[PDB]
Structures are given as structure tokens and as C-alpha cells.
Amino acid sequence: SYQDYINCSREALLEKMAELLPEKRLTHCLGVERAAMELAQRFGVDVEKASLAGLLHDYAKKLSDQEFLVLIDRYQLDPDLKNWGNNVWHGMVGIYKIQEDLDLHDSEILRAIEIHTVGAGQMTDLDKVIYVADYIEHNRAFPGVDVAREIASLSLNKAVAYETARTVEYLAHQGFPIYPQTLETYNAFVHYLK
Amino acid sequence: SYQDYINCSREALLEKMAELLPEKRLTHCLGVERAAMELAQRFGVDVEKASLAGLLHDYAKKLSDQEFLVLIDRYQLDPDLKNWGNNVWHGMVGIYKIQEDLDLHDSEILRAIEIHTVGAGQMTDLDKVIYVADYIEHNRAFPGVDVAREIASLSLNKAVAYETARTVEYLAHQGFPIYPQTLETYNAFVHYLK
Numbered sequence: 001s002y003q004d005y006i007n008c009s010r011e012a013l014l015e016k017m018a019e020l021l022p023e024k025r026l027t028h029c030l031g032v033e034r035a036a037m038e039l040a041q042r043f044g045v046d047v048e049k050a051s052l053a054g055l056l057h058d059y060a061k062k063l064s065d066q067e068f069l070v071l072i073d074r075y076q077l078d079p080d081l082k083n084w085g086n087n088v089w090h091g092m093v094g095i096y097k098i099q100e101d102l103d104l105h106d107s108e109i110l111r112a113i114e115i116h117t118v119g120a121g122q123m124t125d126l127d128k129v130i131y132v133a134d135y136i137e138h139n140r141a142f143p144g145v146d147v148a149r150e151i152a153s154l155s156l157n158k159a160v161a162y163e164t165a166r167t168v169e170y171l172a173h174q175g176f177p178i179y180p181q182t183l184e185t186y187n188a189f190v191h192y193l194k
Numbered sequence: 195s196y197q198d199y200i201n202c203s204r205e206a207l208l209e210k211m212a213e214l215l216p217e218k219r220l221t222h223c224l225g226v227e228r229a230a231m232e233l234a235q236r237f238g239v240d241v242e243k244a245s246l247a248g249l250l251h252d253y254a255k256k257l258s259d260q261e262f263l264v265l266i267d268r269y270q271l272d273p274d275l276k277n278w279g280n281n282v283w284h285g286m287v288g289i290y291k292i293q294e295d296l297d298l299h300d301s302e303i304l305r306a307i308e309i310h311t312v313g314a315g316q317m318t319d320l321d322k323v324i325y326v327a328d329y330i331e332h333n334r335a336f337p338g339v340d341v342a343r344e345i346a347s348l349s350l351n352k353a354v355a356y357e358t359a360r361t362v363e364y365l366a367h368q369g370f371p372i373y374p375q376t377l378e379t380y381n382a383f384v385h386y387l388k
């Protein structure tokens with residue numbers, strides 16, 4: 001059960017998250033919970049760790065900028081983080097808020113949430129499951145989500161590669177700064193597209 | 195004259211380059227020579243340094259992989275360079291071949307050739323002139339070259355930003371590895387697109 005890892009039941013967690021997140025975001029989290037379970041079944045990842053991490057991945061999505069900056073200082077995180085924003089922070093810094101609120105200390109779950117946006121050059125299968133589940137959950141409808149879904153039915157590594165390539169492409173298309181850890185993921189995984 | 199910087203005349207250089215490069219590549223170099231001159235006039239860069247750097251920028255385009263690897267060892271360059279290929283090498287390593295062949299020692303010209311492919315987080319105006327001239331020279335016909343040309347008539351920094359964004363976008367589109375120095379350029383310049 002979820003209380004093996006956190007300080008309340010799944011039902012109680014959902015009630016708390018319903019106060020912190022808008023409806024669309026909570027529905028997304030429920031979508032990622034389900035998608036993570038299915039991917040974990042497929043690729044030999046603990047289904048419970050994957051479901052919980054999937055549900056929690058966007059827990060800190062709505063923390064204010066000031067709250068993140070306070071967390072960066074309190075936990076003495078990389079000071080370069082202050083140069084970025086919510087996209088980077090909600091996972092990479094938000095894990096500390098999740099830890100404070102829910103008493104979450106499992107290192108594997110924490111890491112999977114931490115890098116769910118930007119990935120890393122080295123990812124555990126659990127990391128990969130969350131990173132992919134986020135992109136392919138059933139509420140997502142962006143063009144090419146069908147391709148990502150097909151890829152994820154066959155290869156976890158190729159799905160990471162595909163998602164990361166599309167994200168780099170889209171950020172450059174839009175003219176948004178690209179957090180360097182994303183490129184580390186991109187270069188580590190791009191060979192799987194062949 | 196060019197012999198203020200190298201060990202032969204422009205005419206003599208062109209004869210030597212005609213043996214090293216296929217016709218299309220030499221025509222490109224002549225195009226960059228002209229484009230660099232015009233941009234340098236516009237943005238307060240020495241027109242002679244810009245023209246010479248423009249002509250020379252792709253001098254080492256046709257060196258073999260083995261030749262580059264030998265240069266990496268002989269000059270004790272970053273050993274990570276061995277992980278890449280001609281795209282990265284012909285500028286970043288090719289400068290040493292240019293130096294050996296032509297007795298080119300001018301630091302500004304050498305730097306502009308060195309980073310003409312990947313850029314850097316900090317670029318001199320001469321660096322920027324070469325990086326842009328390469329992309330907009332009159333023989334180039336890729337879709338959107340017209341946009342790059344318009345931008346380059348108004349702002350050197352915006353032209354660097356635009357070129358770098360399109361390159362990152364296209365590399366990710368194609369599923370090619372992205373040399374990390376390119377992202378350093380991208381993140382440093384992307385704000386000029388606004």
C-alpha cells in the first residue's frame with residue numbers, strides 16, 4: 001500500500017492533492033499513475049513504486065517561485081537553479097516539498113520524480129517509466145502522442161529517446177532556454193532512435 | 195592584404211584550396227568571404243580579418259578522421275573530442291591544420307574559424323560575423339534562409355540566435371547528437387529572439 005512509503009493512505013493523499021492542484025493537473029497525475037503501472041508491468045519495474053511516483057510526479061507543480069527559491073537555499077542546492085523556473089524546479093526542487101509533506105524518503109521514488117522533466121544521462125528503469133508515463137498518459141492529446149504510445153509498447157529506451165528528441169526540437173522551435181541536463185539525456189539516448 | 199596574416203597571396207591560397215576542396219565547397223568559401231565582408235562593414239568588424247576568416251573557415255572540411263585524431267593527440271586537445279566527428283572537428287581541430295599549412299597565428303581569426311560551427315557562450319563580433327556569414331552566404335538555399343538574411347541585415351546577435359535555434363531544432367528533428375558547446379551558444383543567445 002502507499003502508506004509503506006508515505007504518511008497517509010492513497011485516498012487521503014488524493015484529498016490533499018485535490019486542494020493543491022487544479023482539476024486538470026490532478027487528472028493528469030491519475031493518468032500518469034495508471035500509465036506508470038502498465039509500463040512497469042511491461043518492463044520489470046515494481047508496479048507500486050511506479051504508481052506512487054507517477055501519482056506524485058507533479059505534486060509541486062503549483063508552488064510559487066519564492067517557495068522554490070527558499071527550498072534551493074534551505075537544502076543548499078545547486079545555485080545555478082535560481083537561473084531557471086518552474087519547469088526545472090517542480091521536479092528537481094519539488095521533491096523536497098514532497099518529502100516534507102508526505103515523509104517520503106525512498107531514494108528510488110524520489111529520484112524518479114526529481115528527473116521526470118529533464119531526465120539524466122543515466123536513468124534507472126523506474127526513472128524511465130515515470131519520464132515516459134508522463135508523456136503518454138491517456139489524457140495527453142498532442143500531435144504525435146500516438147507515435148510515442150506505439151514506441152512505449154515496444155521499448156522503454158526508445159520511448160525515452162523519442163520524447164527527449166521531441167522536447168529538444170520543440171523548445172528550440174519555440175525559442176525557450178533548454179536546461180543543460182536535458183541535453184545530457186538527449187545525447188545519451190538518441191542512439192536508440194536508429 | 196592576406197599575406198599580412200598567412201604565408202601566401204589570396205590567388206595562391208585559392209589555387210591551394212582548389213586542390214583540397216571540391217568545387218561546391220570552394221564556391222561556398224568564396225560566398226562566405228563575400229558575406230563576411232558585408233556583415234563586417236555593417237557591424238564594425240575589420241573587413242579584412244572577416245574576409246580571410248570567411249574564406250578559410252571550411253579549409254579543413256575534407257581532412258580524414260584519422261588526420262583529425264592525430265591532431266587531437268599532437269596538440270593534446272580535449273580527449274572528449276574523439277567521441278565526435280567531422281562536424282565538430284573541421285573547425286575546432288581544423289584550425290591547427292590551417293596554422294601548419296598557412297602559418298596563420300592571428301588569435302582572433304583562429305578563434306572565429308574554431309567556433310564557426312558550434313559557436314560559444316561568449317563570441318566576439320568577428321566570431322559572430324563568421325558564424326552568420328556561413329549560414330547566409332549567397333549560394334545557400336535552404337528553407338528560411340530568407341528569414342536569416344533579413345535578420346542579419348538588422349542584428350548580428352539576433353542572427354546568431356536564429357541560426358543556433360534552427361540548428362538545435364534541426365539536429366533534434368533528424369535525431370543527431372548535439373555537441374554541448376552548441377547548447378551553451380543557444381542558451382546565451384536565445385533571449386535575442388524576443
Ligand SMILES: Nc1ncnc2c1ncn2[C@@H]1O[C@H](COP(=O)(O)OP(=O)(O)O)[C@@H](O)[C@H]1O
Nearest residue numbers: 058087088116117118134167177178179180182
Ligand atoms: N530542458 C528543459 N528546459 C526547459 N523546459 C523544459 C525542459 N525540458 C522540458 N521542459 C518543459 O517543462 C514543462 C514541464 O514538463 P514536464 O514536467 O515533462 O510535464 P508536465 O507539464 O506534465 O509537468 C514542459 O512545457 C516542457 O517542454
Ligand SMILES: Nc1ncnc2c1ncn2[C@@H]1O[C@H](COP(=O)(O)OP(=O)(O)O)[C@@H](O)[C@H]1O
Nearest residue numbers: 252281282310311312328361371372373374376
Ligand atoms: N552541436 C552540433 N553537433 C553536431 N553537429 C552540428 C552541431 N552544430 C552544427 N552541426 C552540423 O555540422 C555541420 C557543419 O556545419 P557548419 O560548419 O556550420 O556548416 P558547413 O556545412 O558549411 O561546414 C552541419 O550539418 C550542422 O548541422
Ligand SMILES: [Fe+3]
Nearest residue numbers: 057058090117
Ligand atoms: Fe512535470
Ligand SMILES: [Fe+3]
Nearest residue numbers: 028057058134
Ligand atoms: Fe506531468
Ligand SMILES: [Fe+3]
Nearest residue numbers: 251252284311
Ligand atoms: Fe563548417
Ligand SMILES: [Fe+3]
Nearest residue numbers: 222251252328
Ligand atoms: Fe561553411
Ligand SMILES: [Mg+2]
Nearest residue numbers: 116117131134
Ligand atoms: Mg516528462
Ligand SMILES: [Mg+2]
Nearest residue numbers: 310311325328
Ligand atoms: Mg555556422
